[PDB]
Design an enzyme around this catalytic site. Structure first.
Site, PDB file in Angstrom:
ATOM      1  N   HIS A   1      28.089 -63.592 -34.095  1.00  0.00           N
ATOM      2  CA  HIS A   1      27.697 -63.449 -35.481  1.00  0.00           C
ATOM      3  C   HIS A   1      28.229 -62.121 -35.976  1.00  0.00           C
ATOM      4  O   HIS A   1      28.411 -61.185 -35.226  1.00  0.00           O
ATOM      5  CB  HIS A   1      26.156 -63.556 -35.621  1.00  0.00           C
ATOM      6  CG  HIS A   1      25.631 -64.905 -35.291  1.00  0.00           C
ATOM      7  ND1 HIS A   1      25.544 -65.885 -36.231  1.00  0.00           N
ATOM      8  CD2 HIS A   1      25.306 -65.470 -34.096  1.00  0.00           C
ATOM      9  CE1 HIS A   1      25.149 -67.033 -35.661  1.00  0.00           C
ATOM     10  NE2 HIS A   1      24.937 -66.769 -34.327  1.00  0.00           N
TER      11      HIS A   1
ATOM     12  N   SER B   1      26.303 -60.830  -9.167  1.00  0.00           N
ATOM     13  CA  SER B   1      25.090 -61.392  -9.825  1.00  0.00           C
ATOM     14  C   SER B   1      24.560 -60.387 -10.862  1.00  0.00           C
ATOM     15  O   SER B   1      24.646 -59.181 -10.694  1.00  0.00           O
ATOM     16  CB  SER B   1      24.009 -61.758  -8.830  1.00  0.00           C
ATOM     17  OG  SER B   1      23.648 -60.546  -8.142  1.00  0.00           O
TER      18      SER B   1
ATOM     19  N   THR C   1      31.715 -57.418 -20.638  1.00  0.00           N
ATOM     20  CA  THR C   1      31.926 -57.129 -22.036  1.00  0.00           C
ATOM     21  C   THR C   1      33.401 -56.922 -22.379  1.00  0.00           C
ATOM     22  O   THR C   1      33.744 -56.866 -23.582  1.00  0.00           O
ATOM     23  CB  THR C   1      31.198 -55.856 -22.456  1.00  0.00           C
ATOM     24  OG1 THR C   1      31.717 -54.752 -21.724  1.00  0.00           O
ATOM     25  CG2 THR C   1      29.716 -55.950 -22.182  1.00  0.00           C
ATOM     26  N   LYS C   2      34.239 -56.795 -21.358  1.00  0.00           N
ATOM     27  CA  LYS C   2      35.661 -56.477 -21.532  1.00  0.00           C
ATOM     28  C   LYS C   2      36.442 -57.288 -20.500  1.00  0.00           C
ATOM     29  O   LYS C   2      35.883 -57.805 -19.534  1.00  0.00           O
ATOM     30  CB  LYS C   2      35.983 -54.995 -21.274  1.00  0.00           C
ATOM     31  CG  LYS C   2      35.123 -53.907 -21.913  1.00  0.00           C
ATOM     32  CD  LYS C   2      35.409 -52.488 -21.404  1.00  0.00           C
ATOM     33  CE  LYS C   2      35.358 -52.326 -19.891  1.00  0.00           C
ATOM     34  NZ  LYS C   2      35.420 -50.899 -19.460  1.00  0.00           N
TER      35      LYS C   2
END
Lengths: 182, 182, 182
Positions: free
Chosen positions: B112, B157, B162-163
């Site tokens: 979003h 785990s 994020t990259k």
């Protein structure tokens, strides 16, 4: 105060209280119906949420959903939760308008004493959670007891929110920290 | 471009689009059948995955499974996913050969706008996820939108990725970072 | 040693072993019955846990629950697990008395070789997990293979426990670390 009133107020209480025990069974009966509903039984799912929650208007919640009581969950307008969210509502969970929960968001108000004897005693407690307006909580995030989240906040996926979050920020990590100001 | 084409391409789109809405219902009908299937209904589960996914050959997915569209999920050969994985496939999720997902892995392409007004507008978007060959993603990991994971990667785990992740590494943590070179 | 004995002992084994494969189907049949049980079918749920687990006395487990074998799970007295916990029990999971698992706790003993060729070979392995008495594991936590947790430990919500935890501490974070001594 009764065990129920203590629970809601964030005082030590006993969950084995007869009334609380009956309340939990009722919530689980409603949740069982919700979670087995057919993909197209939108109308039924809407009725169930109005029977379960302390307050709801417009809400869309993808199955599955889980909660403890139902009646301690208070949603503002235009609420959305994606798949498999959980709300342990021993204390009030108050959520503002236009909230979006991504899959697997957990919100906890329930807690136990850190001391083992206290914890094994049957005594437990809770701390309320309040979330403002226009909050987007990313997938798999955890919102811990006693946290207040302000307005226009983004919680990054996988964040573990252990402390209050002010307005107009992005938080991420474990423990979550501010990663961007809006 | 139509709302659907925009969605797939990673442009702003409106999910309330009629066609996308119908597509989501169809995916949920298939997933409902999958998730209620009897332990021994292996054959049915196989048929359902071939109807749901954009590409599949050999795949074994423990119930439950969840997704948004189905048709944006493209699996290479010999795929395995353990219990209760989720793929939000607004953009393509491309997974190479010999992948193993542990329980509760979430892969997100959906996102979003960070701005509250934009977000509440009904406009949303996505960014594709691409995962290479011989990737093992550990339990409860989160793979965020727009990430590419190379070949022969281990995701520990609980990692929150994020990259991009290059070939031949182990990544762990939140945000994930390289913890070992293979 | 047979493939089964090797699995339990934490040696390399092949899950495609006929006996292990039959065992997994049996566990899934029991879990399917558990997870669909009606809210009020307490008695049935109790019978199922006694059929599934390696050892159980008093246990209360909110649906859903998932596991691999069942027989490698050994619970001490007065066990509680909240909604949607997972135990991958290729090696023994030994849990002491008065344990409390919050929603979505995952305990893993299963692992794979880090090397891609080894991993794709069909060979895998496990490392046992042992948890002491009076342990409270917070929601969404992950307990990794080969970890021992001592007595009177609190694992914070969302913690990813990668190493042993000694007695009388609180651990949190990813990777978890000690955050308080009791």
């Amino acid at each position: 105060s009764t065990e129920k009133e203590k629970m809601i107020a964030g005082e030590l209480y006993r969950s084995a209280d007869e009334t609380l025990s009956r309340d939990r069974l009722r919530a689980r009966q409603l949740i069982h119906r919700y979670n087995h509903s057919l993909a197209e039984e939108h109308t039924l799912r809407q009725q169930i949420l109005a029977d379960l929650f302390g307050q709801v208007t417009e809400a869309y919640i993808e199955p599955t959903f889980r909660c403890d009581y139902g009646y301690n969950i208070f949603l503002g307008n235009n609420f959305f939760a994606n798949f498999d969210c959980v709300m342990l509502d021993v204390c009030p969970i108050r959520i503002g308008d236009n909230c979006m929960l991504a899959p697997g968001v957990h919100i906890y108000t329930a807690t136990h004493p850190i001391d083992p004897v206290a914890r094994n005693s049957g005594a437990e407690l809770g701390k309320p959670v309040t979330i403002g307006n226009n909050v987007w909580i990313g997938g798999r995030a955890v919102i811990n007891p006693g946290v207040t989240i302000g307005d226009n906040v983004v919680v990054a996926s996988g964040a573990v929110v252990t402390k209050d979050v002010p307005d107009n920020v992005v938080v991420g990590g474990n423990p979550a920290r501010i990663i961007k100001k809006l």
